[PDB]
Amino acid sequence: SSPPVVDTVHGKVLGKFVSLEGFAQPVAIFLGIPFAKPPLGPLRFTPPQPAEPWSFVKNATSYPPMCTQDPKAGQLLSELFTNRKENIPLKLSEDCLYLNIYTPADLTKKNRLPVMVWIHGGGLMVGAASTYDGLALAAHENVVVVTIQYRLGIWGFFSTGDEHSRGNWGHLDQVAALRWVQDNIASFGGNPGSVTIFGESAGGESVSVLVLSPLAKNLFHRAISESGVALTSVLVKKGDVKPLAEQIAITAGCKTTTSAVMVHCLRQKTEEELLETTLKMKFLSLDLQGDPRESQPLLGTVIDGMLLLKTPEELQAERNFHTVPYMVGINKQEFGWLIPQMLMSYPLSEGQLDQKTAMSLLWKSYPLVCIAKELIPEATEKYLGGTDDTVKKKDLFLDLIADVMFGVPSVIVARNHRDAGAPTYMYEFQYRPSFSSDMKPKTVIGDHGDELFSVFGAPFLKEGASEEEIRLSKMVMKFWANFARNGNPNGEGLPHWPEYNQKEGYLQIGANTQAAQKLKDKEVAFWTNLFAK
Ligand SMILES: *[C@@](O)(c1ccc(Cl)c(Cl)c1)C(F)(F)F
Ligand SMILES: [Mg+2]
């Protein structure tokens, strides 16, 4: 039947129908809609500008390029995280400010469905919207799914610390995409007055940053951070960002005479030269050469004065953030496998860890955990000191890193959000998907990213899910879309999910799903005391 054609502010777009067996209404899919002007040439390291209007009908049936990034790490992460049966290879380009739309609405009728805007993870250095197929979630839960892209790495986050390159270009792109959704999603059957932003890892940190940003006012109405938050420190630069900028400029062949000189020089480099620079910097890899206090594993969020006016901690203390319903979740083993072993090349192949090697490694982990050298012994002893079994010590070390990067920051964010009067919900996800890499030990459960397969309905798109895994995905999708509808995940036939209030109820999600109380309470107390120094 006739492919769907939709009028947007800037012109008409042509999509395609895709049926999911068992659902009468095919899903209308629109791939590669631009939400900004391509940030090329002089527009590099500047805020996104509106897309230019087009005559006639734009064909939105091909996946867009992904933003320039390490193609090997980008393809690997896509393969590890995709919910599709086969991973789709993607082109690289600086021309990447696109979004993809999956709408289950019958576009010949009138519809105002809740909108779910996905912000992908990747450390702010890698990733793509097209990795995530919105078909199953859209059809199963009657929501419009929008997957967005945003500038990454040098292109998205290069900052001189001053007005010549403030930084946070990729977060400004996320804001631009949400403004586009406000202005256009009703033409796709979506309700611009019910937009939920959700994301995982750096995407969850981005959601948290948008909750803290005045630029995102009135652009969304619920938020979900999965395994990432603004207090995940490795993603937020405090203090002097000039050394990293100078290192990047020097690696690219640029002089560092002034900030304006550095930025102008970098704007003259080709995409290929800046990718060469990216690869020479060896981001996302644990840096084992030199003082770990000088390690820079990624270019990330800064306090730029436009998107973020103060540090997340200061904004939280001032209660200066958007008090929307907010779901904050973590996985049982955030540092269990994928980040250390696939993304960061951790020296941990051997599977036993003695306490001296653990202390040395935790010092090398400074860019991730920020533990002063004098505090390494106490932190290591707290986690590892209770056993002499060095296999158990390795597992407990992985727990330590997971608590510092994800668990404690997540609970602190949730507590501060709750204390501003906003409806707050928390979860801890514990499941080992059958879609896990064959390289992943069978004992790793609730690894970073494991909930994605449930959220995005992989059991309905990939082969070989058990019946338990199918049930888990339907329940998770319903909770998520109930939250998008109502700011409360609860509903008929679902386990009760208590609000994260003074009792600190949270939902343990897995093969058995049930409410629990006080997530990470002792750990928060320990690490808050330790970091108070
Ligand atoms: C996520 O975006 C992420 C990667 C690396 C690091 Cl250090 C952090 Cl804090 C988050 C993802 F890549 F998805 F794992
Ligand atoms: Mg070094």
Author numbering: 4 to 536
Q: Could you share sentences copied from the article?
A:
Human carboxylesterase 1A (hCES1A) was employed as a target enzyme for inhibitory activity (IC50) screening due to its conservative catalytic serine residue.
Chloro-species compounds F-3 and F-4 were chosen to detect their covalent binding sites on hCES1A. This analysis certainly found several allosteric binding sites, although no expected result of any compound covalently binding to Ser221 at the catalytic cavity of hCES1A. Successfully, the co-crystallography of hCES1A with F-3 and F-4 provided promising covalent binding modes at the catalytic triad. Co-crystallography analysis not only verified that halogenated molecules preferred to form covalent adducts, but also provided the conformational information for the design of covalent inhibitors targeting to hCES1A protein for the treatment of drug-induced acute enteritis.
